[PDB]
């Protein structure tokens, strides 16, 4: 037999990774967020 | 002392609440319900901001002193901060 | 400057208005300024990751000593400097060939005298331009536009 | 002028280098549409294609970008939001 | 809110959607990242995703898109960028 | 930019090699058809025809190759598969 | 899985035959790896061996295929290229 042999193989590229964000130059100190302990105002 | 002037201010009748918001709109002292609270100190962060960037705007060497807006249903006072302000509000009535 | 600095002294000083960080600085000798070669243009950033001073962050190769090179106010990085032959050079930064000029003044009896100051004006054109003056020795009021460098218009 | 970075989803080494990048965009252009391209075209090179930058003073934005290749920061009043997408 | 195209790289069926979904948008949502965010979903769902959407006043972009999923027009006085990558 | 060889059957002179030829190509095109024929076209010249390249972000393959010589390796982002067959 | 041919050396049934069973392949295989190994097998089976397919989102390809045994086509944003070499 000429082709003495076939090899098969299967191949997968992997997924990129992606997320959707907020941005807004006019606006309050937190400008985008994703889609209680206060001790945040302690220090002062 | 301070707590001690807060609580004869808020003895007047005048008086229908105050809010010491501290880390922009998380506030710490309150004499109102949760949802007042959180809304309140959220709009007079923002508004106050709004206020400040006015008076620079007409000039470029001057900041806000204070600020008031008044309502048929209250009346609200900032003033100025560099880290905090404070919200009063009042009846007019 | 390093090197330069051994022996030559400060004597212009400006800042870029547009690029804050940009300080321009320019030594010189007091003496010989008529002939050679005396010194270079010395700027250097006070911008991110500017942590040498020491290191010029540009120079500019002036064939002869200049004084009072300033920026326009609008340009982001052009500037034009007096010559102590009497001549006024404009650079433009843009082409980061530092030394290598954009206009060349004339030699003959347009504006001969060893001018003391370049200064720039608003054209009454559009505000994007600017006209450049010098101040002759010899009582005559120079104004050009950056092609007019060369046959000054006033 | 001052940076102040807002968000970021990208790693520490980038985030300089994005602000570094707009500075000396903001400092060699006074057209934003100009200082975006400088800002793009420079990303695309040494982190490899397909970056987007939008710098200017006044807009909001929602977009999608791929994990650790996204910053929006401020140099002054301007703000540069920069990610790879694609 | 008057529509005007400026630049288009867009089927003209596409380029109605986009003034329509832009249109809505402006008249449900005061805030800019809001009225971006309308937007760029629609176009997701209608056709397929990655869309990236930019609405403002002020600012300048330097952007890739895929062939012929790209638009860039004004309503009133607010431009919208609104285009696909990735 | 950086090789990362994930499979293959082939040998240690061929899996260099095909590195090598694939990070000229990549330097030399931007676009993966001709990133692919670069490839391919140096292989059939060296080691006989008929090899077949496929270069991308986003695939899966199944093919059919000859013992000794596949190999499917990373260079930066990009996945190239060379093989022969016929 | 609207399908669009772009380039195709193949007889008209086949062509038909082959959108058909790409078709079915993506309703019923969600991984690339396996839509590919679907739609080879079933060519084997009827057209004889040797085929090979590449199915995905973002790649170029160069290849070298026997007469009248080549298709390239769309389903979708997802290309698939399917033909017979060796």
């Known amino acids: 037999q ?42 002062k | 002392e301070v707590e001690e002037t807060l609580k004869r201010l808020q003895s007047q009748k005048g008086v229908q609440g105050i809010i010491v918001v501290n880390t922009e709109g998380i506030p710490i002292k309150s ?31 001057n900041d806000l002193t204070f600020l008031r807006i008044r309502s048929k249903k209250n009346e609200i006072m900032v003033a100025p901060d560099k880290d905090y302000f404070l919200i009063v509000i009042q009846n007019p009535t | ?27 010189r000798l007091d003496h010989g300024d008529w002939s050679t070669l005396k010194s270079f243009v010395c700027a250097w950033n006070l911008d ?46 843009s082409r980061l060939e530092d ?30 331009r600017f006209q450049v003056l010098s101040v002759a020795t010899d009582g005559k009021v120079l104004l050009w536009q950056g092609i007019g460098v060369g046959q000054l218009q006033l | 002028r001052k940076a102040v970075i807002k968000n970021a989803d990208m790693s520490e080494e ?36 397909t970056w987007h930058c939008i710098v200017g003073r006044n807009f909001g934005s929602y977009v999608t970008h791929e994990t650790k290749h996204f910053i929006y920061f401020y140099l002054g009043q301007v703000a540069i939001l920069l990610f790879k997408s694609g």
């Open chain 1, 2 to 43: 000429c082709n003495e042999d076939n090899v098969e193989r299967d191949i997968q590229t992997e997924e990129i990774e992606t997320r959707e964000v907020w941005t807004q130059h006019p606006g309050e100190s937190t400008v985008v967020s994703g889609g209680t302990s206060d001790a945040v105002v302690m220090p």
């Open chain 2, 31 to 61: 004499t109102m319900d949760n949802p007042t609270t959180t809304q309140y100190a959220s709009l007079m962060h923002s508004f106050i901001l709004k206020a400040r960037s006015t008076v620079r705007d007409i000039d470029p060497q």
């Open chain 3, 1 to 27: 400057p390093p090197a330069q600095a051994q022996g030559l002294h400060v004597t212009s000083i400006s800042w870029n208005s547009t690029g804050s960080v940009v300080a321009c600085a320019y030594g």
């Open chain 3, 48 to 93: 991110r990751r500017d942590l040498r001073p020491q290191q010029p962050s540009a120079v500019v190769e002036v064939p002869s000593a200049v004084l009072c090179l300033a920026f326009h106010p609008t340009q982001p990085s052009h500037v034009a400097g007096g010559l102590y032959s009497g001549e006024v050079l404009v650079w433009d930064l």
């Open chain 3, 99 to 128: 030394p290598l000029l954009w206009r060349t003044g004339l030699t003959d009896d347009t504006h001969t005298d060893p001018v003391s100051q370049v200064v720039w004006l608003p054209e009454p054109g559009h505000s994007h």
């Open chain 4, 14 to 49: 980038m985030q300089q280098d994005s602000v570094e990048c707009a500075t000396q965009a903001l400092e060699k252009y006074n057209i934003e549409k100009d200082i975006a391209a400088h800002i793009k075209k420079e990303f695309d090179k040494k982190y490899n294609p």
